[PDB]
Design a binder for this molecule. Structure first.
Ligand SMILES: [Zn+2]
Ligand SMILES: [Zn+2]
Lengths: 154, 154
């Protein structure tokens, strides 16, 4: 049934925002767009984590959503986690106007991201090209600044 | 797919809690439990609403999850919304130790509640036996005290 999803991001600091998802055909890409504020200028890792579990804050969301058991990558890679959406970019006012299109995540089926956690991270995602253990796990993107559970939308 | 879900309830007031969901068999019943605190002693409407959308707080969840287009009821009714879990009871210390078993909600398929909103209400749900139009729509449970998106749990 689901063609639209939405996510409210909050954390302990000032980072907050709203992200929209739209998938018109189940065999088609998902459009991801919206605004996150309170960010430092530059790149921030932007990931779908495995669990829609916020009991302990962002930490409860678990690792990247990774049902094919691959190593971390960027959204252009064949070797990637399902939840690898690469970076978003905050302007000099702390605002990331997100606009992404991705055909690996979905609003149904196995790769479905509904009821999982969208997280925006402290630092840039190195897209799995960093050369340490951590690169292949989380792309060295550091802290979880804000997260939310991805919800069915009207 | 999912055998566990979790929901963190938050609102503008003091109401807050964690509800777990467990469904070992896709075609078996769902267990609902955990605690909500900060409630007034007495009955509170406990419903799954249609949208997991929190962009305007609890209001943006919309009406009760009703995929079969029926009228509000108690969970033991045949004429009920999928989202009709009835009431929870807060004790004299303001705690609802929720414990509910339901055969209509599901963690998979088309009644799937993952990615929708769990709401705890201001007043008792009259189970649709209240005589007004409100009763057959919302059970007169009143305003939304706390909600959260139901997420995939580990
Ligand atoms: Zn990853
Ligand atoms: Zn109802």
């Amino acid at each position: 049934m689901a063609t639209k999803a939405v996510c409210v991001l909050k954390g302990d600091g000032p980072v907050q925002g709203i992200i929209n998802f739209e998938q018109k055909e189940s065999n088609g890409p998902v459009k991801v767009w919206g605004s996150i504020k309170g960010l430092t200028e530059g790149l921030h890792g932007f990931h779908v984590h495995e669990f829609g579990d916020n009991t302990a804050g962002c930490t409860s969301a678990g690792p990247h959503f990774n049902p094919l058991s691959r190593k971390h990558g960027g959204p252009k890679d064949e070797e990637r986690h399902v939840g690898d959406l690469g970076n978003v970019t905050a302007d000099k006012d702390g605002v990331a106007d997100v606009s992404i299109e991705d055909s690996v995540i979905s609003l149904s089926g196995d790769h479905c991201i509904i009821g999982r956690t969208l997280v925006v991270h402290e630092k840039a995602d190195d897209l799995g090209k960093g050369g340490n253990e951590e690169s292949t796990k989380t792309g060295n993107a550091g802290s979880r600044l804000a997260c939310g559970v991805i919800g069915i939308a009207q």
